Every structure is written in structure tokens, then in C-alpha cells.
Write a protein that binds this ligand. Structure first.
Ligand SMILES: CCCCCCCCCCCCCCO[C@@H]1O[C@H](CO)[C@@H](O[C@H]2O[C@H](CO)[C@@H](O)[C@H](O)[C@H]2O)[C@H](O)[C@H]1O
Ligand SMILES: Nc1ncnc2c1ncn2[C@@H]1O[C@H](COP(=O)(O)OP(=O)(O)NP(=O)(O)O)[C@@H](O)[C@H]1O
Ligand SMILES: Nc1ncnc2c1ncn2[C@@H]1O[C@H](COP(=O)(O)OP(=O)(O)NP(=O)(O)O)[C@@H](O)[C@H]1O
Lengths: 244, 236, 238, 239
């Protein structure tokens, strides 16, 4: 037990080359069906290979913020899948490194990643997406801006920033629900139904952040603390899942 | 009995890479619905249909990608565990797991053909009837200037055959060293295909170039790349 | 300090690969657990350390009941484990393979964490492989790091599963010397190798286990002159 | 036959893990290649069968030059190979592990393909594991399928790399009997195990190889009474 040791540099560098490969596979593929649609109906002379394709290239920082929870969940299981398969994760647990500390070594390398997703999701993503509407319409909001929408607008009166103020807390409970089904014996369950099980049980928690989110019109709970209940109710049962 | 084993390890990892890739790209099309329900001033009766009918425009790009990203996941799994070095050292050559990566490429090119001419147009006669030009079935009767179709409806089937062939020799990277990170030259080549071939029809279609001459010299140069890279043992 | 396992059992497809096994080991003596490729001297090692859940067993560290503790909780009470299935970290070095388990044991400072890894690579003769890789190692050289990594945790009650699986004729009599120098410092291991000439000349007792059952137990000068042992183990005329 | 390897060499980081090795093996005699965890008795086995490309070598099947043929082309000329790194198919059965290499050898019909797999599982005593799985096997039981799968190809010139790596005391003297019954039928193997009491009592010659070099060669009753062999191999005071 040391802050940022050697095993934390080993799990933190194994999955990091799998986060950045699932992100490249998802950002590029969403950059095709935005390329196909923005070129299918061209109409005018400004809409061709360039100018209507430059609109896609100026829209990839918007496609990082929406695809990082689904790529950092997906790559953390493909990265821990190659460790438990080659039996080099049982020898960590058989030497004092508890499975909560395997979970902590993912938070030391994915929570500084969503803070990079947050830092480009409010400074360069609304700037570049609005700039993309000017090289496409030349002759043919934010997060800090929502602090200006706190009262001066005249389920929604506050509950749009506070489900994005803690995305680092909401991304992290998706990880700990994922890497609780990875551990097990190596003989019978052949590592196929341990990743697909982990993606599915970590996907049910991703739909229950915008379905349980707009549900303040039942009693009148504060929306700032009422939007924290889905994460914290599974963060408790996750820390039991990898304790037994 | 070893082609049956090479099939059921890719076909068990092609399904689990198709559904996971569909749920990611439809949750995104489910959260734009919340951006088009309250502030768009329209009710919610059509999203239940529009989810299930928003599929075949999406499941015609990832249906080729659910093949060759399913082959890299299960050939690289068979190389690090040294399962193919015993396949070579008992007989059979590298032209068996080409033959095995072309049996189930037929199984995907059948489904990707039903998707492109029996459910492609069926979606747009149910997307344009509830929640509102080139979506017929057979085009060997007319002679319209939009010859993008029958050269883009067809080469979403040769894309299944060719991308399965170009990823057999891109998996052998794992004797005893090196990285497993071999998904990058296969994915960076699949971007270059769909930045040219599906987009040679709106700047080089509609009366600019001929989309039969140029929509196959991109497709056959990109097929001879999948043969000269596979036949790398008697070069010179 | 006596690790004790009483009446373990395990069945996979209704086969009952382990039957009423009961092995006890003190601290300061090393004990063999031998038998053919039947018995399950690894499934017994799984149920003691805790990878697979047992069915009828009872594991006691001398007064306790750790039979429902997970894998990592027993590793801090003293149980060490060396697996059979070739488990190195494969992309750290050999110096980082030893150092990654020395970032535990919160009694070593930055001084004695550095001269323990530089001393463990002297008694195993792997100092010329100081930073090669994990992947680019070789058979017995891979096995000599997995033993050196397992002795680096400073446990009690080590369960060495196949230590001499294809090492050397020289590096076994060099491992056997430093598995006895740790025996004198109060540490009792459970060797279960298959060449029964290096494992029986170092153990003090033995548990010859056939298909699910104990069939013999006693001194190493006794195990050879039992005739039911020579029928299902030991070959013949040994 | 005579497989011959002449003046092989291999260097990874400028280390030269193999030096001027030269081993020849006839058909009908079995030959040892022993040494510590130095020499590279697997890197020599890699350069003969052809997984890694050699640097200065020359491999001859008795009159030919197969030194630039790929891995699969040498396996049809007669070279068989048993790897060290635990290579079963892991999701086929044990009956399908033996049958998957019997779908080659286009001289067996559907009759003698079926009574060869049912006979190979008798001389190895793995008939009670007829359909378990590959994954749910166990150590030496995994090793007894990889040997039985390698003898099922009917090759010449087998290069058995660690056959007895943690098997049994009984199943080794049962494997040694059926590696001599194939020796009498014109098939010469290259055993390279580490317990030098089962491998030296079955071989006819030996090549004790240290860090990159041959240091001894001769009869098995000679290899023990060489003193430079007992310094870097054999332990000490060995019988
Ligand atoms: C990159 C994108 C993510 C890649 C995900 C990789 C997932 C691969 C896991 C393969 C899962 C195999 O699961 C099989 O799912 C099948 C679906 O039919 C089950 O049947 C089988 O029992 C079960 O073995
Ligand atoms: N998950 C499993 N499913 C079915 N059978 C299994 C499983 N795990 C082990 N077995 C069987 O249980 C028996 C004993 O396994 P195991 O505990 O590994 O014995 P073993 O001692 O390790 N063999 P060896 O290591 O050579 O002494 C063998 O017949 C295996 O086939
Ligand atoms: N790819 C590689 N890169 C660097 N060093 C390597 C590589 N492959 C092997 N080596 C080294 O080469 C030496 C011999 O390797 P190897 O041929 O496997 O010997 P070996 O005979 O297999 N050891 P053993 O099987 O126990 O007898 C060892 O020191 C290895 O570390």
C-alpha cells in the first residue's frame, strides 16, 4: 500500500491503452454516420467533401464527452480481462493486494481521465461546435453557462448541471459495478461470460441516470441532492460486491 | 472439425460485439430524444417505433465492423495461447483460417444484404409515414442519373467479404513478445474506405464523375491490398 | 501456529474430485502432498487458499475459522500461494516482478525494500535478467521468478504448487537450500512436486493422496516401503 | 532420412543467445539435447521448425534445403513439434483434440480415423476424460493430451520439447514405452527434458549445450563421467 506504486502503474497502463483504443473506435465510427448524413443532402456548393466534412472534424470534441462513459467502462473490462485470463491477477490477491485496491488503481487512472473529459467538455467543445455552424452556414449550451441559468430562466429547475457536476462520481460507480464480475476461478467460466456480464450490469446503471434523474415531481426533494441518490445507492452495494 | 472450432469462436464473439456496439450507438439516439421531447414541443408516441426502425441505417456500417473486429479478438486470443502454432505444426497451412474466415463472412454478407435491400427501404416507408427519393428495390429497369445506389447498395456486401480477408494476416503479432495493439492498422484502414467509397457519390456522383468507374478502382485496389498482404511467402 | 484443513470436499459435475481430505501442517516443518494426476492436490490447494468455494470443509488457522473469508483476506493472515499455471506479470521486468509485491509488507522502508529485491536475485541466480521483460523469459527461468516473488511476500504457511516443474538439476538443490533456511525461521510450506527424489528428501512428512482419498501418511522413509503406494504412485522398484 | 542443422545462430538484443550449434539426427534413433536454463534448447528448436527466422543457419532434410520454408511447409515434409508453453485447444474436448489433427493425413478413411483416436486414448490412459473440456484439465493430464496430439500427426523427426514436465512417476515409464515402439518403426525424436534419469536412460546420444555452445556429445554412459558437464549441469555426485 503506497500512493501510485508499481502495481498501480501496471494496471493503470494496461487499461489506458484500451481506453484510448475503444475511444478511437467509437469516436471515428460516430464520425462516419455524421459524415454520411451531412453529405447525403448537400444541395448547395458549400456542401461537398470539404466544408461538410470539416464539420465532422470540428465536432469530435462533442463526441468525446458523450462517448467517454461508454468507452471507459468498455475498455476497463477488456483491459482487466487480459489480466485475469493469464492468471496474473490471482497472484495479486494471494499477496495482500485486496480487490478493493485493484478497484482503487482504476480510479487513479480513469478519474483523471474524466476530469480531462470535463475540461474539454466545457471549454473547447461548445466553442468548436458553435464554430462548426459558421463554416457550414456562411452564405446558405455549456456547463459554466448553466450557472447563468440557475434562476434567470424566466426536474428542470436545477437538475441539468448537477447530473453533470458529478460525472467523475457517476463514472466511477459504473467501473466498480463492472469489475466485480471479473473475479472468479479460471477453469469453468471461460472469460466470455464475465466481460459481457460486466458490460450489461454496467449498462443498466447507465440508463438509470437519466431515467431516475427526472423524478423530482413526486415529493419535492431538492434536485441537487436528489440527483445523487442513483449513484450513491449502487456505490453502497458495489462496495459490498467486492468485499463479500 | 477445426473449421467448426474457428467458426464458433468468431461467431460467438461477433454477436457479443454487435449488440454491445448497437446499445452504445442507440443510447446516444435515446438521449437525443430527451433533447427532442421537452424543448422540441412534440409528444412521445413515436420513439417506441423510431428506436426499432432507426436500426438499418445504423446496422449497415457496424455489420462489417462486427466481423473484422470479431476476428482480431479471437485470432489474437488463439495466438497468445499458442493454439495456431500447433495448427501449423500438424499439417494445415494459413489457408485454412482464411477458409474459416470466409464461411462466416457469408453468414454476415447474407444478413447485411437483407438489411440493405429488404429493410433499408422498409424503414423509410415507415419513417416517412409516422414521424416525418432513392429507396426502391431493383434499379436495372430505370436509367436515372443517381447511380450511387447499386454501387453503394452492392459494395456494402463486398465490404463484408474483403474486410474479413484483410485481417487474417494482421492478427499474427504474438509469438512471445510485442503488443496486442493490432486493432489500430485495421481500424485506420476501415476509416479510409468509408471516407472515400461511401463519399464518392455526393462529390463524385450526381453528375460529377461516373460512380461505376471510380467506385470500384477504390474497391479493387483495396481488394488487391487484401491479397498481396495475405500472400507474403513467395513474393521474390 | 498450525494451519488445519478438516474434511474438505468438492464436486464439479457430480464427480467428487476431492473426498474426505484432512491435512494439518505446523509452523517450522515442511510437508509433502503427493499423488498421480488424479487426486486433486491442486483442488485441495484451491479450497485452502480460497479460489473455489468448498462444499463440506473447515479451515482453521490454529484457533480461528477462515473458511468463509475471501482470497485476499487469507493472504494477509499468512497464507501464501504459488500457482501452477505460469503466472508472471509478463510486461513488468524481473526487478519489477519482485518489487511489485514488496510495495506491501508495511514494515520495510525504502532502504530494505531495495536490498531485499537485490538479495533475492542473488540466491536464485537471476541477477543477469535484471530488466529483460516478463514475456521474454524461458521455462525454468520463468519458474524461478514465480518462486522468488512468492517468498518475497514474507508469509507463513506457503502452499508451493509444483515448484520444480522443469527447472534444472542445479537450481533445485539451490532452491532446496533456501527453502530450508526459511524453515528454520519458522515457516512451514506444503510442497507438491512430482519428481519424488527432491521433494521426499526435503520433506518431514507426506500425504500420498489418490483419486479423492488419503492412502498413506508418515515418514519419508516409510512412504517408499508401502506397497499400495507403489501400485498407484512411485512407479515400481523405486 | 537424416535431419541436419548446421551452424545456427540467433541474437535478440545483440546478446547471441545461440552460438555455433550443429546437431544431426538420423531416423530410428532418439537424441537428447540437454543443458541449464541458459543455452536455448528451445531457440534451437524454434530455428529448426521455423517459428523465428535464423541468422546464420542451414537446415537440411538429408539432401534438401528447407531453411527458407515457412512453418507449415516443414510440417508436411515430416517435422513434428510439441511446444513448451501449454498449448491445447482449450474448448474442444479431449476426443476432439485428437481428432482435429486426424482430419489431416489423407491416407486414413473414416474407419481408421476413429480407431486411432480410440487407441491413442488407451496407451496414454486418458480414456476416462473422453469429453471433459480442454480448459478443465489438470497439469500432467494437459501434458498427456499434447503428447498424444503430437504423435497423432504421424510425422518423422519429432522435436519433443519438455515431454515429462510434471507428469507422473508412472505415466513417464508408460510414455517411454510408446516412444520406443515408435522408434522401432523408423521415427527419431529429439527429447529435451530436465529430469536426467528418464531422458538419459532412453536416449542413444546427447548434446549437452551450455550458454550458446556445445560442450559435450556422446554416449549416455559418457555424459555423466565428464567433469565439465557436472560443473554447469547434472548437479553434483550424480549417478
Ligand atoms: C471492442 C468492443 C467490445 C468487445 C467485447 C468483447 C466481448 C467478447 C466476449 C465473448 C462473449 C462470449 O459469450 C457468449 O455469448 C453467447 C451469446 O450467444 C452465449 O451463448 C455463450 O454462452 C457465451 O459464451
Ligand atoms: N472445473 C472443472 N470442471 C471439471 N473437472 C475439473 C475441473 N477442475 C478440475 N477438474 C478435474 O479434477 C481432477 C483433478 O484436478 P486437479 O485438482 O487439477 O488435480 P491435479 O492434482 O492438479 N492434477 P496434477 O496437478 O497433475 O496433480 C481432474 O480429473 C480434472 O479434470
Ligand atoms: N524474445 C526474446 N527476447 C529476449 N531474450 C529472449 C527472447 N527469447 C528468449 N530470450 C532469452 O534467451 C535465453 C534462452 O531462451 P530459451 O531458448 O527459451 O532457453 P530455454 O532452453 O528454453 N530455457 P529452458 O527451456 O528452461 O531450457 C534466455 O535467457 C531468454 O531470456
Amino acid at each position: 500500500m503506497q500512493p501510485f506504486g508499481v502495481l498501480d502503474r501496471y494496471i493503470g497502463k494496461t487499461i489506458f491503452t484500451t481506453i484510448m483504443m475503444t475511444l478511437f473506435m467509437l469516436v471515428s465510427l460516430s464520425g462516419i454516420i455524421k459524415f454520411v448524413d451531412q453529405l447525403k443532402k448537400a444541395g448547395q456548393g458549400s456542401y461537398d467533401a470539404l466544408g461538410a466534412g470539416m464539420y465532422t472534424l470540428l465536432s469530435v470534441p462533442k463526441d468525446v464527452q458523450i462517448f467517454f462513459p461508454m468507452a471507459a467502462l468498455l475498455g476497463a473490462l477488456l483491459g482487466l480481462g487480459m489480466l485475469a485470463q493469464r492468471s496474473e491477477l490471482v497472484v495479486m490477491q494471494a499477496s495482500g493486494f485486496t480487490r478493493m485496491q485493484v478497484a482503487l488503481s482504476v480510479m487513479k487512472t480513469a478519474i483523471p481521465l474524466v476530469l480531462l473529459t470535463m475540461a474539454i467538455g466545457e471549454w473547447v467543445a461548445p466553442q468548436g461546435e458553435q464554430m462548426a455552424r459558421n463554416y457550414r452556414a456562411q452564405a446558405m449550451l455549456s456547463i459554466s453557462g448553466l450557472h447563468n441559468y440557475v434562476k434567470y430562466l424566466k426536474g428542470r429547475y436545477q437538475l441539468n448541471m448537477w447530473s453533470k457536476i458529478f460525472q467523475p462520481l457517476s463514472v466511477a460507480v459504473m467501473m466498480l459495478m463492472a469489475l466485480s464480475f471479473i473475479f472468479g476461478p479460471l477453469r469453468s467460466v471461460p472469460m466470455g461470460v464475465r466481460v459481457v456480464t460486466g458490460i450489461s450490469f454496467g449498462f443498466v446503471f447507465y440508463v438509470l441516470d437519466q431515467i431516475f434523474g427526472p423524478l423530482t415531481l413526486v415529493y419535492g426533494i431538492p434536485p441537487i441532492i436528489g440527483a445523487l441518490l442513483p449513484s450513491a445507492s449502487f456505490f453502497l452495494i458495489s462496495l459490498w460486491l467486492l468485499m463479500r | 472439425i477445426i473449421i467448426r472450432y474457428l467458426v464458433r469462436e468468431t461467431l460467438k464473439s461477433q454477436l457479443a460485439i454487435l449488440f454491445i456496439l448497437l446499445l452504445i450507438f442507440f443510447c446516444q439516439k435515446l438521449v437525443r430524444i430527451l433533447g427532442a421531447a421537452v424543448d422540441g414541443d412534440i409528444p412521445a408516441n413515436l420513439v417506441l417505433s423510431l428506436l426499432g426502425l432507426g436500426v438499418p441505417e445504423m446496422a449497415q456500417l457496424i455489420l462489417p465492423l462486427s466481423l473484422f473486429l470479431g476476428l482480431l479478438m479471437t485470432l489474437g486470443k488463439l495466438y497468445t495461447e499458442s493454439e495456431i502454432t500447433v495448427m501449423h505444426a500438424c499439417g494445415l497451412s494459413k489457408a485454412v483460417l482464411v477458409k474459416a474466415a470466409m464461411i462466416l463472412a457469408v453468414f454476415t454478407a447474407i444478413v447485411a444484404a437483407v438489411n440493405v435491400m429488404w429493410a433499408g427501404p422498409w424503414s423509410s416507408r415507415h419513417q416517412d409515414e409516422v414521424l416525418e427519393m432513392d429507396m426502391r428495390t431493383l434499379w436495372n429497369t430505370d436509367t436515372d442519373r443517381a447511380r450511387a445506389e447499386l454501387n453503394w447498395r452492392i459494395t456494402l456486401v463486398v465490404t463484408v467479404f474483403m474486410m474479413a480477408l484483410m485481417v487474417v494476416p494482421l492478427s499474427v503479432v504474438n509469438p512471445r513478445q510485442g503488443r496486442v495493439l493490432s486493432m489500430l492498422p485495421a481500424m485506420l484502414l476501415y476509416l479510409l474506405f468509408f471516407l472515400i467509397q461511401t463519399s464518392l457519390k455526393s462529390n463524385g456522383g450526381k453528375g460529377k464523375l461516373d460512380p461505376t468507374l471510380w467506385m470500384w478502382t477504390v474497391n479493387l485496389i483495396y481488394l488487391a491490398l487484401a491479397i498481396v498482404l495475405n500472400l507474403w511467402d513467395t513474393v521474390f | 501456529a498450525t494451519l488445519t484443513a478438516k474434511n474438505l470436499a468438492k464436486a464439479y459435475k457430480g464427480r467428487r474430485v476431492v473426498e474426505d481430505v484432512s491435512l494439518t501442517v505446523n509452523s517450522g516443518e515442511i510437508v509433502g502432498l503427493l499423488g498421480p494426476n488424479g487426486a486433486g492436490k491442486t483442488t485441495t490447494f484451491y479450497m485452502v487458499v480460497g479460489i473455489v468455494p468448498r462444499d463440506a470443509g473447515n479451515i482453521i488457522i490454529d484457533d480461528d475459522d477462515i473458511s468463509l473469508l475471501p482470497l485476499h483476506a487469507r493472504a494477509r493472515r499468512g497464507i501464501g500461494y504459488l500457482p501452477q499455471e505460469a503466472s508472471i506479470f509478463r510486461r513488468l521486468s524481473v526487478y519489477d516482478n519482485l518489487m511489485a509485491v514488496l510495495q506491501i509488507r508495511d514494515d520495510l522502508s525504502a532502504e530494505q525494500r531495495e536490498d531485499r529485491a537485490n538479495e533475492l536475485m542473488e540466491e536464485f541466480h537471476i541477477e543477469h535478467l535484471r530488466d529483460s521483460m516478463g514475456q521474454s523469459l524461458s521455462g525454468g527461468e520463468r519458474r524461478r521468478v514465480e518462486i522468488a516473488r512468492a517468498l518475497a511476500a514474507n508469509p507463513k504457511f506457503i502452499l508451493l504448487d509444483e515448484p520444480f516443474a522443469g527447472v534444472d538439476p542445479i537450481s533445485v538443490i539451490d532452491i532446496k537450500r533456501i527453502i530450508e533456511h526459511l524453515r528454520d525461521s519458522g515457516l512451514g510450506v506444503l510442497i507438491t512436486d512430482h519428481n519424488v527424489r527432491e521433494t521426499l528428501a526435503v520433506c518431514e512428512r507426506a500425504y500420498i493422496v489418490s483419486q479423492g482419498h488419503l492412502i498413506a501418511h508418515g515418514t519419508p522413509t516409510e512412504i517408499l516401503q508401502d506397497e499400495h503406494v507403489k501400485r498407484v504412485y512411485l512407479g515400481e522398484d523405486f
